[PDB]
Amino acid sequence: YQTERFTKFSDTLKEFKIEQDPFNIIREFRSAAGQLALDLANSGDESNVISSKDWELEARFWHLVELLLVFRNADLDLDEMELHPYNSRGLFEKKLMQDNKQLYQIWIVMVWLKENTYVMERPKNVPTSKWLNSITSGGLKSCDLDFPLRENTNVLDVKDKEEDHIFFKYIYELILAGAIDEALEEAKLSDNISICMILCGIQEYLNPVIDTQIANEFNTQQGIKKHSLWRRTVYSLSQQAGLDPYERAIYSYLSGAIPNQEVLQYSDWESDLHIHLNQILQTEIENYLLENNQVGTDELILPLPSHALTVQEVLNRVASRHPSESEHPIRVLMASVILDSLPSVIHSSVEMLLDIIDKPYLLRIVTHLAICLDIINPGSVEEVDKSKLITTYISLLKLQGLYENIPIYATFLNESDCL
Amino acid sequence: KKERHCRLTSWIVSQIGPEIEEKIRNSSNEIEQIFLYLLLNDVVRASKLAIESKNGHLSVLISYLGSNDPRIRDLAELQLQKWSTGGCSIDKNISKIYKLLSGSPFEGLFSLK
């Protein structure tokens, strides 16, 4: 049956033109692609695993589109936040994310990135308690994480290191996926209290009593006041070798830094891009705080880089670092959406019809995207480009023998007359 | 309340200052020094020495001293009970520091009394 696909997308358009909000179209496009992603994936010829991934990718694209256009377009402007110098850093961070839409967009994108991150299954047969092997062998004179750092790592049993590896890797995957609550649960429950505690430093300080404008979200002070310190402390910890590469990786991510080579070598376009947007973000916040004298000089223990990249440049670098992946045609759209250069790319792939015909999803996707765009933002895509796109896709509806559902797509030109 | 608290504690640190600095002068053990820096309510130099003496995890932990995060409090205490029930050996000053993180350093069962 699967050669139904176009129906689903077409179907969604029917429902829209007929209850005469348009963001639902895309939401459905997403779900549609996802549903199809499942079909080709389950039981299939290994020629299908490929086009299955091109559907999952499809789906992620629709999601990213929804998220960003919702934020950008459903922008109806709220009330400005008036801080005082007595206010906590927490509030200033919030203010920053409110006022600077460019940067919040980075947040949105990171959220999307996390959403679609793979995490291993929870490690089984985890041991009763930490470093149990070393303790049992005798030779841990101190039971604290820093003991084998104070003096040769030869202290820790091999099996203990192997388990610490399992743990820190799992925690790392969870952190990259946004699963911070799960990471704290794992830390707690796996007898890694001190690491847990480390994960608690992630929050900026708020006090509901002082920072009135969040006395709703909070009933109790929380987060840590000397955060610039925390951050250097963690970063330095991240640079100290004789720690497991995933642990160092974790601290890197937390300090707004770029994890060690041993770990980073396995990160893909999404993972890598995520890492570097995290860096942009971290740097930008800490700079925002410095420009408002909410950082205390004592805390500038160490040099961290102060110069934030632009999303443009991060993308360019990550691209050159992952050319194959970068060049994949829906991930180009992903980037195009991220930079807003989107009608830009529409008109572009339009002129590539004048090695876009070779891949099937593309001509469809661009067309339905163009439709959505001009629905949500009348004017968005050049009238001509709509004409050209629908023209060509329609002729494929004909080549597929689905003339049945051509009128729906017609509802965008007087050129429709000619059908 | 915060203001008053901060002035009182800055003052106490003014008084105990030389006592402790003398003690740091004579220590022969780094973790003990880290503890003494906590005795001068200097979280940052404790964190730094920890870092330098290659005690990095502790260092991170230290950064919590003076945020009253009850999670961290009950976790630190938990770690202490687990040690004080088996725990073949834990360094004498690391336990002291954990006891500080517990929020009840004498009021306790690993007591600084």
Side-chain angles (χ1 to χ4, degrees):
Chain A
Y1 94 97
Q2 192 197 139
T3 313
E4 213 75 53
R5 56 201 78 186
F6 324 89
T7 327
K8 296 217 168 177
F9 293 84
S10 80
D11 232 325
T12 306
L13 298 160
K14 284 177 193 212
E15 292 160 334
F16 180 80
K17 198 221 71 159
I18 318 289
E19 200 208 314
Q20 39 60 220
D21 179 43
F23 290 126
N24 285 292
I25 298 178
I26 308 159
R27 230 162 271 139
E28 272 205 293
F29 285 164
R30 183 201 181 180
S31 200
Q35 189 52 59
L36 296 162
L38 300 173
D39 296 28
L40 288 150
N42 264 319
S43 49
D45 220 55
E46 296 183 65
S47 74
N48 302 141
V49 174
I50 301 302
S51 51
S52 162
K53 305 166 203 160
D54 285 324
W55 277 113
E56 291 157 342
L57 265 166
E58 245 251 44
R60 297 169 186 182
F61 171 70
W62 295 119
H63 193 205
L64 211 196
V65 165
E66 173 202 20
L67 296 173
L68 280 175
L69 288 176
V70 164
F71 168 78
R72 290 179 198 169
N73 225 121
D75 228 284
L76 289 191
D77 316 294
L78 306 173
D79 265 305
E80 183 90 89
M81 194 148 84
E82 282 158 354
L83 300 193
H84 299 287
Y86 66 68
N87 281 134
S88 311
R89 284 193 176 211
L91 269 189
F92 283 84
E93 198 177 34
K94 299 215 168 189
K95 175 142 162 125
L96 176 63
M97 312 306 283
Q98 271 196 17
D99 293 1
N100 177 339
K101 300 193 211 166
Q102 265 279 26
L103 191 169
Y104 193 68
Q105 242 148 119
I106 289 191
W107 180 246
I108 296 279
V109 167
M110 290 175 60
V111 166
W112 167 79
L113 273 164
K114 291 172 193 152
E115 193 114 27
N116 309 313
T117 292
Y118 173 90
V119 180
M120 63 193 273
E121 75 183 19
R122 206 176 308 87
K124 309 186 193 160
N125 268 296
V126 154
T128 34
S129 59
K130 171 112 200 190
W131 289 350
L132 183 61
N133 289 285
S134 302
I135 307 267
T136 292
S137 299
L140 275 181
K141 307 204 180 206
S142 189
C143 296
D144 75 279
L145 300 191
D146 281 343
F147 177 74
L149 304 184
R150 256 177 282 145
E151 47 216 298
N152 60 78
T153 332
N154 217 60
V155 153
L156 283 189
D157 189 297
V158 183
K159 298 162 178 212
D160 281 333
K161 294 173 160 192
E162 292 171 334
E163 265 148 4
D164 275 27
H165 180 76
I166 308 321
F167 174 73
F168 286 122
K169 175 155 164 202
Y170 182 43
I171 295 285
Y172 181 71
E173 302 191 355
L174 287 172
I175 281 180
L176 291 176
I180 303 295
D181 286 317
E182 292 80 350
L184 301 155
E185 198 185 36
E186 255 285 315
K188 291 193 217 86
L189 297 193
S190 74
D191 195 10
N192 273 291
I193 285 77
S194 292
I195 293 296
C196 190
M197 292 193 291
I198 301 185
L199 302 178
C200 294
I202 289 165
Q203 280 99 81
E204 220 78 59
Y205 181 74
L206 288 152
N207 183 319
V209 183
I210 302 189
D211 308 315
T212 273
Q213 42 276 74
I214 51 73
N216 231 320
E217 299 162 35
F218 294 95
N219 33 38
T220 290
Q221 80 282 344
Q222 194 188 60
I224 87 80
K225 299 183 192 175
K226 281 186 184 73
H227 211 276
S228 286
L229 172 64
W230 179 75
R231 189 192 181 204
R232 279 85 188 163
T233 314
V234 169
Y235 173 81
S236 167
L237 181 51
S238 92
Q239 289 293 297
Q240 273 172 56
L243 295 198
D244 188 279
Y246 284 101
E247 177 174 15
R248 305 204 309 277
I250 289 160
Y251 305 143
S252 285
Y253 189 91
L254 300 188
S255 335
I258 296 185
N260 69 83
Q261 233 303 102
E262 197 161 3
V263 170
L264 199 64
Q265 92 201 91
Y266 299 137
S267 48
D268 57 285
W269 194 80
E270 290 95 40
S271 246
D272 187 331
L273 168 59
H274 175 200
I275 302 287
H276 286 61
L277 291 177
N278 182 55
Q279 175 163 68
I280 295 200
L281 183 53
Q282 202 99 332
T283 299
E284 284 292 359
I285 283 102
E286 182 146 284
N287 280 299
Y288 185 65
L289 297 178
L290 295 160
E291 288 157 43
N292 285 286
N293 320 282
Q294 290 287 329
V295 176
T297 178
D298 299 310
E299 294 180 52
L300 303 188
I301 307 321
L302 294 167
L304 293 177
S306 62
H307 170 81
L309 287 193
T310 74
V311 162
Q312 172 72 76
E313 258 280 308
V314 167
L315 279 169
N316 281 340
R317 294 186 183 173
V318 178
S320 76
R321 203 167 323 124
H322 298 264
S324 38
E325 311 187 49
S326 319
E327 290 161 18
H328 190 301
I330 103 295
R331 254 193 284 267
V332 180
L333 293 163
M334 285 180 172
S336 305
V337 160
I338 282 163
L339 304 156
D340 222 332
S341 71
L342 194 52
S344 330
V345 182
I346 300 277
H347 192 301
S348 179
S349 44
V350 155
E351 309 206 22
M352 256 234 155
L353 303 144
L354 200 39
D355 305 334
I356 171 169
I357 309 192
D358 295 333
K359 337 227 175 152
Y361 49 78
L362 192 46
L363 175 51
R364 189 219 305 111
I365 297 166
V366 185
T367 307
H368 290 81
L369 179 60
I371 301 278
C372 270
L373 276 151
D374 269 299
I375 289 165
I376 297 167
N377 278 322
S380 256
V381 198
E382 191 182 331
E383 257 185 301
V384 188
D385 282 324
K386 309 176 236 133
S387 311
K388 279 186 161 182
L389 277 171
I390 307 167
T391 306
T392 314
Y393 181 66
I394 280 182
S395 69
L396 295 192
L397 299 175
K398 297 172 170 188
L399 219 201
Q400 283 286 292
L402 285 175
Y403 307 102
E404 302 180 325
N405 288 347
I406 302 194
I408 303 58
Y409 295 81
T411 314
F412 304 95
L413 305 162
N414 212 50
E415 285 308 272
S416 187
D417 272 292
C418 309
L419 299 156
Chain B
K1 177 193 171 176
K2 284 323 178 63
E3 189 67 274
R4 188 179 310 276
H5 175 262
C6 164
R7 310 254 199 79
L8 167 64
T9 199
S10 309
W11 176 87
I12 292 177
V13 166
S14 312
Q15 312 303 295
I16 67 179
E19 192 195 354
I20 299 306
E21 268 148 4
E22 240 303 283
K23 290 186 152 293
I24 298 175
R25 232 186 311 294
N26 311 320
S27 69
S28 310
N29 161 305
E30 308 248 58
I31 317 78
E32 175 182 51
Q33 292 176 42
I34 296 169
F35 176 76
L36 295 170
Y37 283 112
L38 303 177
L39 287 184
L40 300 170
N41 199 21
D42 196 325
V43 167
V44 172
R45 264 187 309 171
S47 228
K48 284 176 181 175
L49 177 49
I51 283 307
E52 288 173 298
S53 54
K54 189 62 185 136
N55 302 286
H57 296 100
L58 219 186
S59 189
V60 178
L61 300 187
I62 303 282
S63 74
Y64 301 138
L65 295 169
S67 331
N68 191 204
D69 192 303
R71 305 174 281 140
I72 306 292
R73 237 159 54 197
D74 305 344
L75 259 354
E77 177 66 13
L78 182 51
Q79 184 62 93
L80 258 10
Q81 291 164 347
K82 280 182 149 311
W83 289 333
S84 61
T85 336
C88 100
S89 303
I90 216 305
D91 176 284
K92 288 168 177 181
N93 297 297
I94 280 101
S95 62
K96 291 175 198 175
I97 301 175
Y98 269 71
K99 193 56 166 195
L100 299 180
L101 298 145
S102 85
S104 318
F106 318 99
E107 343 188 327
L109 90 113
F110 228 113
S111 189
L112 303 184
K113 198 185 204 295

